[PDB]
Design an enzyme around this catalytic site. Structure first.
Site, PDB file in Angstrom:
ATOM      1  CE  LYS A 233     -18.957  60.501  42.717  1.00 46.55           C
ATOM      2  NZ  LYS A 233     -17.972  60.886  41.671  1.00 46.55           N
TER       3      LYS A 233
ATOM      4  CD  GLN B 107     -22.261  42.208  39.350  1.00 46.78           C
ATOM      5  OE1 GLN B 107     -21.879  41.810  40.448  1.00 46.78           O
ATOM      6  NE2 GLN B 107     -21.423  42.515  38.368  1.00 46.78           N
TER       7      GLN B 107
ATOM      8  CG  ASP C 268     -31.657  57.872  47.633  1.00 51.50           C
ATOM      9  OD1 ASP C 268     -31.498  56.842  48.321  1.00 51.50           O
ATOM     10  OD2 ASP C 268     -31.697  59.018  48.125  1.00 51.50           O
TER      11      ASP C 268
ATOM     12  CE  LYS D 182     -13.894  55.737  35.471  1.00 50.79           C
ATOM     13  NZ  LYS D 182     -12.835  55.661  34.431  1.00 50.79           N
TER      14      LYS D 182
END
Lengths: 485, 489, 485, 489
Positions: B105, B75, B110, B117
């Site tokens: 990823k 988070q 950036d 998921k």
């Protein structure tokens, strides 16, 4: 077997028993009411369970990660209820099973709450109070940010591993961080201290509930005729909060305690044991080992001859091995699951009455419901009614006095209450209302369970009757709700 | 091994590599910098995992219970991102590992997103459209009631087992039930149809991403000298293993820039042609009937194409195609991991032994995430890209050309017309749309990420081990985000 | 005098100048427009002032009470802007005066923000970083609970006594406690680090603003004819970040730095001082004392012969005593209020231009506005446009090349850009956009101030022109808003 | 000395007294219990002070700026309580002192409220009702926008310069502008008219509270033994030194219980009658015209009634009527501080010197706060008190009486009629209303608070110094909440 398998089997047996009567006696078409029994498949699994992994700071500057779990079983009633346990033996299966049990326990005593449970994989003895406070506050924040703490969503409660201090921390954190604009921000948790919004009579709730549950069944002629009873002799296995208060209340009403046992050696005295002296001895130093006017009884007290046995102790004390050797005819399950299913069959073979734990120890849940209501009312119970009721009682007594004086021609004073009535009037407080409500709830639930047991031609198998009653109550709500979407 | 073990090992290796530099030359005491390394052990575990069991009613008046899972990893960037998979083989471990992968990823390219998921233990082949729609509606409602769907909280995306229809259902549900008062209620999901707020160029995102990832590295002379090749495209050879959308678009884009495709594989037999294969004819043949079997001008090559002689290999197929058994037999010097996890660590070690370049999957197939980010931005802006700028830019360009024309005419006493754009520029002007902006942004992101990865690899004295370089870069970024935020609260 | 009286007198003079022209030629009745000038008396006082007294626990188990103040001046624009100061000499009057100044400063540069100020009565040198962080967190919570921190309500900014660490803590607190459900929770504060949502080019904002403000006026032929100027010589007093950046940019644009002053002794060199070498020497050890190629000037540099003087240093450096002795034709007020009103009259007597501090140092506010916009956009500037613009430029160059090839029979290559253009293309970033916007804002504000000064027949009294412009801009909003009901 | 210094000294003395007992075994580590007394220094200062300056438009098309202040002292209980004053002498110090006093006053009578105060520097006599209404609306809106009016945050109450019209306007504004979606928007202010959500018995609250406070101490034999009097109102006499609401109601309630009023004072000439004065006749005469001057059967007493020989004295009038000069000349052994601080600290020493009981104003005049609490509870309940219970109770009573009658008839066997109630009980049954419940609750609260104050005074070996006992009790009650709250970080 673990509690998970036990509760699964209990629910399966209850559903199998109830479906036949439920298909016809409650429905309105095409005989597809059996296809509606998929509702019974909806109730069994847990709706939600969440796993948290959060960091804390620790006093010596080293970072640590703590894991926790929170399971919510049913949302058929909007507010969910459940305890929080701090232990290294917690797991998803245990919290799911306890949450499942909570819904049925609440439904038995007609408490409009769901079921939930929480567990933090932590060792309380290895931490400083500052670290414990930080852990509780971070856990409360994490639960709040995902919708698991709300006063109208989920209301946690203390357990055997936590106390009112943790509840005070949780309430303060919620009222200061997330529920700032909520007018009922202090109703998000139960078990708080009185100064923080707690309720009176919370300490002795479970013992009084157990006493009332035993009293309700012991005064029914139909069951006593089967058991051949009706003085009173009882043996308590365990001297915790529940056992101590249960023994106090039982002895107050004219019952004799024969033996008391604990994790260490036991105590036996045919003449009886005074609860106050035993409590003082226990509080003085360690355990009851060495209590005067008491003999160090050898062997398990479970086989001791008594009319009532209260196993308010660790898990599954009674098994199939010692089942045929017990002498007590009535067993009051003070703890959660002190007997194995095989022992239930053994007892039922020799008509041994077993009061289920699903109903006996719901006094804590009832008092938690009362505390939640008090927090919602923003006022203590009876503050606006005690003086008015006293005035009404005095007016009634004066009316009787004047009416009697106007018939028999001088000195007649019915306006004098009895000593107990005078003490009740002078010492009026909030806990009287809580105790009265607890007694009323216990009596009504006992009557409902007895009627349900009579309906399905069950004998002394009160556990199945209670489970059937709870399943019926939940199914009625699901059926009449219409099921959205 | 399963992906969970591989990602755990990759993270552990990256943390071990980075801690040495991260302790000393990072911050301001008492040598407690090795004690603040606990920040790293905060990154590894997942933050939130939730599992649901919800009821639906079948078409034949029967009830059913469906199980689902949703995991949020980090988070540090409050918009979480992740796909939803409808499959009967989903599990908590798989979604946890995939969310952990998604965090890194996103951090590599950036993109200010977290990781998440979702998986529903249901196969689509056994349900009708109505039942699937009801399942999606109930799942969306259950996620909404617990804070897992919000436009500023969590933005689900399509996967291989779901499509834009499910995304439209989810968006409609959220905008009609919970996000009624939210002005950005339609930004809660990505991959929606264009009529519902979708973005142009979403279909071919991953192909452009893979093409740009390969192109950026293939033009670097330093790595070409090590591999003993010549820089730039042209006279190159590449083999695609798998003919999905990713492989098809990658082949089209590579062939457009002067590359020859020799072999194409699939679950069934393969293809081989030294003269090259036309992407358009092959796509037409595949769309005509079934697979590419029997395609004209195609020899039915026998055996695995993985060992075929080529310069670039693109394993855009099922997981762990390459293992230690076939590792020392491949002839390709550059491997571009189109899919997620097509090679095992033993194979990576073998490739490093014989200096075989392996482009990591963490960076190569991140174009879809970038395009989803662009779609989220478009939904927040409540307007399409270029709506208020195309005509103004056209006017500015014409004014510049006319100014050049007049200035040149002021020097010579005939008629010069520089105001005529080229055919390519005229076509660009006439066909201006949103997909041009999307593709330009994708190319810019893929260039920046590649340059950062190369710089990080150079910094830590790593060779052709680009996977560890990417992992170190992502870990550095996440650690910086935690450290500068004050952590303690 | 104190700045409260300074700003009160400035506003009173501005309102007195405006009233007559404003009444006649602004509205379409009964000549009672002069009675509507009560609107002016509405603008002058501050709207809200809040005083906070909150406890913290020190490192050594000790409790302390910290006091602070927050003043909001005008709500004619919903988002208020202002700094936070940590000092033991803060007071309500100072924060009120600064909040009042902030509204006019924002209105001059057309920034849709209000005015606010905050002060905390703490000496930063007597506290540990943990204690400072705790103080910042508690202060942020207290401001949030009363509606003073919101992204659409009030956006604090750093000051001299606070840095980016405090603003990072503030943003984290607001995003984690109150603005959890807000999608723009990170836009509640400005000055954050780049990793936390900051903006590029924030460090050198004020220097570029001062340089552009000086450049805009120095290139206006009408004013330079009056001053008789038009190479460039300037002397800066004070070597903070503002002075350092201003000197860097001025020397980059062909100006000569004759002298540099500070709290300690001065520095003089007729041949000029290199900003890079001086900055390196200062960063090496202590102050600029002992700098090579620098004579140790003795006396006050205020009277040194220079074309431009930049008093970007401590408070009230120019007074009525030393006013006649200065030789600088142009004075650029880098700091807040370095000139007394009597000195203003003395300068007006002998044609000394004084660029107001209200307009000169608004670059920080402009960049704060840009950072707020970036945080609202949830994306950095130019990310989706750099590649498209580069492609368009290359296409235009290729088009010119092909068009020029159609007139002649060898090879022409206009496609090659200049070296500076190539560097600009390769190194495109957000700071280019920020600097471009800052320059545009400064130019527009300078033009507006010149027009306002010409309108009211004012001479070199630019301070009154700026105040008149700001007052008119605020009055227009109040007049057209309907003044509510 | 002003009230600021007086309350500061009172709190300082209370804290100094309570500290020694509080550090000791009364609370359960390294002897840091004396170092946590910083909690006390947290309680003393006010938490929040807000200053407002808002514009209005006058009747003659002219604009004006009105300034006001609102101070909140303690947030240990979320709903703050306090009055609003309209006068051109208000200042930050006065509102701060009154807000600080309000917390202790609420804590004494066990009312879960904080402390607050509001003041508007305005003269009510120079404005039209329309202008006053506009001022009230704007002030309410300004307080609402900054979080100072909320039903769960802060509940204003009337004062001597404001009436129920202003509170009706405040409630209407809050329910129509900000609290539109709040189900309890009408609980944001107390003192409203009955038709707008007010409560019965609010007018005579303070006088009844003062009467109950005096009656509780009069019947305590232990204190009367020290004072040398006899318990009961039989031979007692009282002198009132005011003719406001408090003075009017207090003497009427005292006369209703056999107390004889020998003198009455006011801002003008006094009245003296050994036989007694009728409150009803005096009230009617005063309402007929002017003041009580010229009342028949009333000797026009000349001089200061403060020195008049009486058993008890009630100074419900202007500030600090009793001083050091007047102290030795008072012939009353009991003084009931009906007003708000009519006794100087110096005079307390003289009163303690010769055994003169001084009932604190902190506890005596707290009936209004209790009734405001009851009104807030009624507004939250959305129903009047006793509506669903009045009819049930009479059925229960009649059934009880009939049961007694049947049992008595069974025992003997002509006719017995216990069913008939007494005349007073019959009138109580017929005229059952909500004000009965309100008065019952007020009496219960006053009794409990008096008992607690007596116990606290006995605990700390204090004599007739009830003011310090009340302050110590309030400080202990507030410290309990702060200590058990844990103090959030």
């Amino acid at each position: 077997p673990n509690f998970f398998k036990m509760v699964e089997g209990f629910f399966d047996r209850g559903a199998s028993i109830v479906e036949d009567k439920l298909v016809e006696d409650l429905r309105t078409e095409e005989q597809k009411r059996n296809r509606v029994r998929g509702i019974l498949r909806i109730i069994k699994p847990c709706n939600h369970v969440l796993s948290l992994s959060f960091p804390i700071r620790r006093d010596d500057g080293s970072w640590e990660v703590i894991e926790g779990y929170r399971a919510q079983h049913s949302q058929h009633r909007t507010p969910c209820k459940g305890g929080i346990r701090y232990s290294t033996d917690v797991s998803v299966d245990e919290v799911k099973a306890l949450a499942s049990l909570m819904t049925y326990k609440c439904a038995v005593v007609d408490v409009p709450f769901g079921g939930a449970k929480a567990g933090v994989k932590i060792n309380p003895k290895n931490y400083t109070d500052n670290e414990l406070e930080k852990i509780t506050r971070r856990f409360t924040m994490e639960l709040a940010k995902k919708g698991f703490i709300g006063p109208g969503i989920d209301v946690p409660a203390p357990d055997m591993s936590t106390g009112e201090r943790e509840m005070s921390w949780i309430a303060d954190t919620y009222a200061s961080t997330i529920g700032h604009y909520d007018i009922n921000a202090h109703a998000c948790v139960t078990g708080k201290p009185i100064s923080q919004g707690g309720i009176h009579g919370r300490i002795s709730a479970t013992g009084r509930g157990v006493f009332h549950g035993i009293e309700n069944f012991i005064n029914e002629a139909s069951y006593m005729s089967i058991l051949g009873m009706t003085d009173k002799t009882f043996v308590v296995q365990g001297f915790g909060n529940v056992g101590l208060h249960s023994m106090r209340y039982l002895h107050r009403f004219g019952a004799k305690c024969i033996a008391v046992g604990e994790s260490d050696g036991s105590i036996w005295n045919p003449d009886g044991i005074d609860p106050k002296e035993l409590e003082d001895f226990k509080l003085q130093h360690g355990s009851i080992l060495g209590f005067p006017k008491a003999k160090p009884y050898e062997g398990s007290i479970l086989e001791a001859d008594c009319d009532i046995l209260i196993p308010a102790a660790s898990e599954k004390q009674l098994t199939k091995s010692n089942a045929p050797r017990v002498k007590a005819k009535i067993i009051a399950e003070g703890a959660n699951g002190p007997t194995t299913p095989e022992a239930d069959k053994i007892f039922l073979e020799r008509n041994i009455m077993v009061i289920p734990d699903l109903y006996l120890n719901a006094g804590g849940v009832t008092v938690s419901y009362f505390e939640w209501l008090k927090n919602l009312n923003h006022v203590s119970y009876g503050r606006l009614t005690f003086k008015y009721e006293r005035d009404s009682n005095y007016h009634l007594l004066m009316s009787v006095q004047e009416s009697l004086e106007r018939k028999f021609g001088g000195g007649t004073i019915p306006i004098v209450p009895t000593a107990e009535f005078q003490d009740r009037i002078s010492g009026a407080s909030e806990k009287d209302i809580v105790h009265s409500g607890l007694a009323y709830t216990m009596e009504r639930s006992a009557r409902q369970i007895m009627r349900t047991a009579m309906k399905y031609n069950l004998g002394l198998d009160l556990r199945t009757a209670a489970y059937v009653n709870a399943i019926e109550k939940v199914f009625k709500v699901y059926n009449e709700a219409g099921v959205t979407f």
